Write a protein that binds this ligand. Structure first.
Ligand SMILES: COC(=O)CSc1nnc(N)s1
Ligand SMILES: COC(=O)CSc1nnc(N)s1
Lengths: 300, 252
């Protein structure tokens, strides 16, 4: 189990770690998060109490380095940094643990939620969507735009999700216009899976990462990407059976975890009604359809 | 975006543009089968692709063989229309290609956009105008060439005959849409109006009769009366009561 120490907490802030969150008061003696499960990516995120503008946070994997948080009073945010001195870091953590100044990652043993949300999410793939190669961790916030959003303006601060556009020459073979537009299997299987993602695991990883950025940061372009990747599968008549079953599991846990009160902004009525009730896969998402109908029957 | 009464004069400006109407592409007669079920029989159709400024009509005749062994024909018809309009654009020299294509039915937007991906600078637009182009098959010479077709065929017409020698394109278009609206509302009476007088003929190379300027005013007045008359028969309204302002809103 790994640890992300904090130098201090000089400003009042709600701190998230994965799907958990807790409030820290201004100048409270908080010095970090311990007992972080090894084996998953994680996200540590922030919303300041005095300016809920800009939720922001950091994706990281404790296997890739020793990371800590320190407030920067010039840039006005909690920054993640890497500590290269291993014995300094161990000594800092030990002292803070001895004084019990850390919150414990509060995982119930029965609980597979975080695994189920990050099953296909890899740090190496995150770092290609979020380009800042001098760090092993990746910053995301509420306002960052996607490459596609920018084509329709600072390229270094963009979310380089894979561009999906149903009315594009990439999606539509010359001479197969009607076929490819009404059945997106070509675009899904040849262009995206075989061509760009190489396999369904990478596709699902990007899908899951897009959902998590939408949920945790209210990142609108991430929400667009999550829905586009769902719609591309649902609108394909030919999808490997293992992908459909896995998608049903992925979406089920996403819908299960979504705050009930954020459904209006995080869920696109058109996409979900189309995917669950009109699409080729309308009958392939049993778990997802059942939780959506019991939890968000208004949307449908 | 969409084309309406606010931007109506844009139809007669110098940017090459075409209307596309797909109403008459997929045409059927519905009939009973020997077993007492219902079946359709397709008949030849056409795409109505019109330049509003010049009157040039690209009439692509849709022969019933294009439907053979196909499913979901009303859906296919939209994509076939889009395919044929795209092929027409590609067949035109660059200086003749449209800058805009206006579809009369919004269901044509996605099929045509997808077929025109190679032409990102050609705007595909809907219209809020209710245009009577479905009545094209009430023009005898157009109906004749469509029904007689034994294979796919493109036939070129000027739907304004020689009117542009004497009137603007705005006035020609207004005269065309009033003729077509009348033919659409009461075909029999409209054709009666257009041919009642045997001394006025249709030139071999024209679609409509050779009316003088004054005869056109009489004809256009008779067409407005027909559309008014039918409007009254429809809703059970005493049209005699109606004022001139009241008549102006109804005619379109
Ligand atoms: C007789 O040819 C021209 O006037 C070319 S300019 C133009 N044609 N069509 C339009 N809609 S604008
Ligand atoms: C009913 O819609 C119209 O545009 C009628 S006005 C008109 N027709 N013919 C002319 N010469 S002016």
């Amino acid at each position: 189990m790994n640890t992300v120490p904090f130098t201090s907490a000089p400003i009042e802030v709600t701190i998230g770690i994965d799907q958990y969150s807790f409030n820290v008061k201004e100048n409270q003696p908080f010095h970090g998060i311990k007992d972080i499960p090894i084996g998953h990516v994680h996200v540590i995120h922030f919303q300041h109490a005095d300016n809920s503008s800009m939720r922001y946070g950091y994706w990281f994997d404790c296997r890739m380095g020793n990371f800590y948080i320190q407030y920067d009073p010039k840039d006005g945010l909690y920054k993640m940094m890497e500590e290269r001195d291993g014995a300094k870091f161990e000594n800092i953590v030990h002292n803070f643990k001895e004084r019990q100044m850390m919150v414990s990652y509060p995982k119930i043993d029965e609980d597979d939620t975080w695994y189920n949300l990050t099953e296909f999410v890899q740090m190496d793939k995150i770092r290609k969507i979020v380009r800042k190669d001098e760090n092993q961790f990746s910053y995301v916030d509420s306002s960052m735009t996607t490459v596609q959003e920018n084509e329709l303006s600072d390229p270094a601060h963009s979310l380089n999700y894979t561009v999906i556009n149903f009315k594009s020459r990439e999606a539509i073979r010359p001479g197969h216009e009607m076929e490819d537009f009404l059945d997106k299997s070509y675009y899904l299987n040849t262009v995206m899976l075989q061509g760009i993602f190489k396999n369904s695991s990478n596709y699902f990883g990007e899908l899951q990462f897009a959902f998590l950025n939408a949920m945790f940061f209210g990142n609108y372009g991430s929400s667009l990407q999550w829905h586009a990747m769902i719609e591309l599968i649902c609108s394909s008549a030919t999808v490997p059976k293992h992908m459909l079953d896995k998608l049903d599991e992925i979406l089920y846990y996403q819908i299960k975890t979504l705050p009930e009160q954020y459904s209006d902004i995080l869920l696109n009525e058109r996409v979900w009604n189309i995917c669950l009730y009109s699409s080729f896969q309308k009958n392939s998402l049993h778990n997802t359809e059942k939780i959506m109908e019991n939890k968000y029957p208004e949307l449908l | 975006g969409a084309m309406n009464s606010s931007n109506y004069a844009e139809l007669f400006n110098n940017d090459i543009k075409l209307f596309v109407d797909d109403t008459n592409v997929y045409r059927v007669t519905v009939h009973k089968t020997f077993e007492g079920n219902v079946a359709t029989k397709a008949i030849n159709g056409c795409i109505f692709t019109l330049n509003p400024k010049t009157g040039h009509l690209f009439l692509k005749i849709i022969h019933t063989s294009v439907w053979a062994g196909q499913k979901r024909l009303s859906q296919l018809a939209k994509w076939k229309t889009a395919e044929e309009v795209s092929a027409l654009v590609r067949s035109l020299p660059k200086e003749e290609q449209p800058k805009q294509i206006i579809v009369t039915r919004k269901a044509m937007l996605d099929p045509l956009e997808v077929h025109m991906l190679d032409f990102p600078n050609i705007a595909i637009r809907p219209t809020e105008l209710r245009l009577p182009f479905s009545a094209a098959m009430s023009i005898d010479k157009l109906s004749d060439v469509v029904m007689k077709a034994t294979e796919p065929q493109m036939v070129l017409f000027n739907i304004y005959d020689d009117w542009l020698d004497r009137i603007s394109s705005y006035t020609a278009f207004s005269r065309l849409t009033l003729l077509l609206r009348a033919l659409k509302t009461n075909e029999e009476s409209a054709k009666m109006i257009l041919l009642s007088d045997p001394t006025i003929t249709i030139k071999s190379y024209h679609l409509w009769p050779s009316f003088t300027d004054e005869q056109w005013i009489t004809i256009e007045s008779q067409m407005r009366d027909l559309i008014l008359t039918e409007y009254g028969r429809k809703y059970n309204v005493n049209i005699s009561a109606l004022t001139q302002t009241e008549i102006k809103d109804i005619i379109l």
